[PDB]
Structure 1
Amino acid sequence: DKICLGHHAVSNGTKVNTLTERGVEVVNATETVERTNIPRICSKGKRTVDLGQCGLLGTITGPPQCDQFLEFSADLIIERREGSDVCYPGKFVNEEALRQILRESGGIDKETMGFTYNGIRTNGVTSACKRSGSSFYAEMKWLLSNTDNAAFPQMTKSYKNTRKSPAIIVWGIHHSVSTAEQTKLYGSGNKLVTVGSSNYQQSFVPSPGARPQVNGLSGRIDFHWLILNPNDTVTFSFNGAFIAPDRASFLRGKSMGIQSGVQVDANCEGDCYHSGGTIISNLPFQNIDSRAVGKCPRYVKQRSLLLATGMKNVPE
């Protein structure tokens, strides 16, 4: 006449690992590393800006691709492989620093620097940057000599940040296909453009010479930039080979930027993004993408790590 104690079990448990052996069968376990991606930019609730064909730095200078994006405003900014920062071939010096800035900017608000000038042409244009016919960077101006080979008045321009936030100033240098046609543009002689705020000093020389054709042309503008701080001044001492900023840029607030190739989806919420979609998971670890950004589980090397939620499974 007796009583026995015992515990439950089942036909197949789940195998897990312990400090002392590999593959103990437990009643129930649960996964701890996320493997399932969902292939969309889960963007519900957030002010999103898919730049598409506009390059992020293009929002500062304004090639035709970026005309809808010169004063954007976002919680989340998506860059695309097809996007270009440029119309007239060229590049930004110190470029990724500018991107990491813009990505977290929550958008940009433009404002003129007011510049007018005397003794120059201000309206140079190109077949690369097409709007109606040949055009140019919306936010900048090709400054030239009045007539072929004319002297470029040695000029100085200054803008002061009237605001209580720091500005983004961007100028550029025109490297002409030849020293010959450097002259047809900006006149003759050694060409000096010099640029100092007061927390920054530096100066620039053009660099004419052959380059292979890109958008048809063999010339390059290389854009430069510095963050001007409140009640600071920036002075532009220059002689030619200059593309001049019409408007400065100010940053709106906070955001996060990502790079991706999958569709926006406003039915989905998510805070962990990678280029192939969104990691929706409450699990501590993930094996999807080690460069995921946002608020993510930790990337681990392991495909799987099972956590026991029941006792040892002993059957007969």
Structure 2
Amino acid sequence: IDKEAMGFTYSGIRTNGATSSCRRSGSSFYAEMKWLLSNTDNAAFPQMTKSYKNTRKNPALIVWGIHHSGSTAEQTKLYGSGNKLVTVGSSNYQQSFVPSPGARTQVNGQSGRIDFHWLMLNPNDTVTFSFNGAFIAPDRASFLRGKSMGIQSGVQVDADC
């Protein structure tokens, strides 16, 4: 995988969303995703639209996340009140997503979930992320390198045979 930065800028919203499940010298998050929040708790969230153009000569593995919070007092704490939406479009793709809060079972100490989705942006195509909350934004798009093969095993690797 060859990671290539997207260069998104964020105007007036928080970005350092962290959690206690991802322990990396304290409380952190994913290394290639951002958790876009409001400026403080229970504050509003402006409607945004960010775009990326695949300039290279190969398909680009784009990945974004949707946050399904644990409560309805948790979704409003981090993206304000109201009904939220994430719209994702391309020249070969169109879908849209809506967060769905609610309690569920504790995994790693939390009851919220993050749904990761993906598409392969064709060369000289454009992806667009309309959102107003519950969006785990991408940071670096990914590109494939060549040909290999993947196995699943339980024994040790030997470099002699």
TM-score bracket relative to the smaller structure: over 0.9
Alpha-carbon offset, residue 219 of structure 1: 0.8
1:161 corresponds, among 33, 39, 54, to 54
Alpha-carbon offset, residue 252 of structure 1: 0.4
Deviations 1:6-26 (A, max 9, x none): xxxxxxxxxxxxxxxxxxxxx
Deviations 1:284-311 (A, max 9, x none): xxxxxxxxxxxxxxxxxxxxxxxxxxxx
Q: Which runs of 5+ in 1 are unaligned?
A: 1-107, 267-316
Percent identity (aligned)? 93
Deviations 1:184-224 (A, max 9, x none): 01111111010011210010000100011111111111111
SS of 1:121 mapped into structure 2: coil
SS of 1:231 mapped into structure 2: coil
Alpha-carbon offset, residue 147 of structure 1: 1.3
User: Rg: which structure is higher?
Assistant: 1
In 1, Cα distance between equivalents of 2:12 and 2:87: 19
1:151 corresponds, among 44, 69, 79, to 44
Alpha-carbon offset, residue 148 of structure 1: 1.1
Alpha-carbon offset, residue 122 of structure 1: 0.8
Deviations 1:117-161 (A, max 9, x none): 102101100010011001000000000111112111100000001
Alpha-carbon offset, residue 113 of structure 1: 0.4
In 1, Cα distance between equivalents of 2:42 and 2:93: 32
In 2, Cα distance between equivalents of 1:158 and 1:169: 12
Deviations 1:93-137 (A, max 9, x none): xxxxxxxxxxxxxxx000100001102101100010011001000
2:134 is the alignment partner of 1:241? yes
**Runs (4+) of structure 1 moved beyond 2 Å?**
none
In 1, Cα distance between equivalents of 2:88 and 2:73: 26
Deviations 1:26-72 (A, max 9, x none): xxxxxxxxxxxxxxxxxxxxxxxxxxxxxxxxxxxxxxxxxxxxxxx
Deviations 1:217-269 (A, max 9, x none): 11111111100011000000001000000000000011101111111011xxx
Deviations 1:72-91 (A, max 9, x none): xxxxxxxxxxxxxxxxxxxx
Which residue does 2:63 correspond to in 1?
Answer: 170
In 2, Cα distance between equivalents of 1:134 and 1:148: 18
Which residue does 2:123 correspond to in 1?
Answer: 230
In 2, Cα distance between equivalents of 1:230 and 1:198: 11
Which residue does 1:218 correspond to in 2?
Answer: 111
Q: RMSD of aligned C-alpha atoms?
A: 0.6
SS of 1:235 mapped into structure 2: strand
Q: Which runs of 5+ in 2 are unaligned?
A: none
SS of 1:234 mapped into structure 2: strand
Which residue does 1:193 correspond to in 2?
Answer: 86
SS of 2:96 mapped into structure 1: strand
1:205 corresponds, among 78, 94, 98, to 98
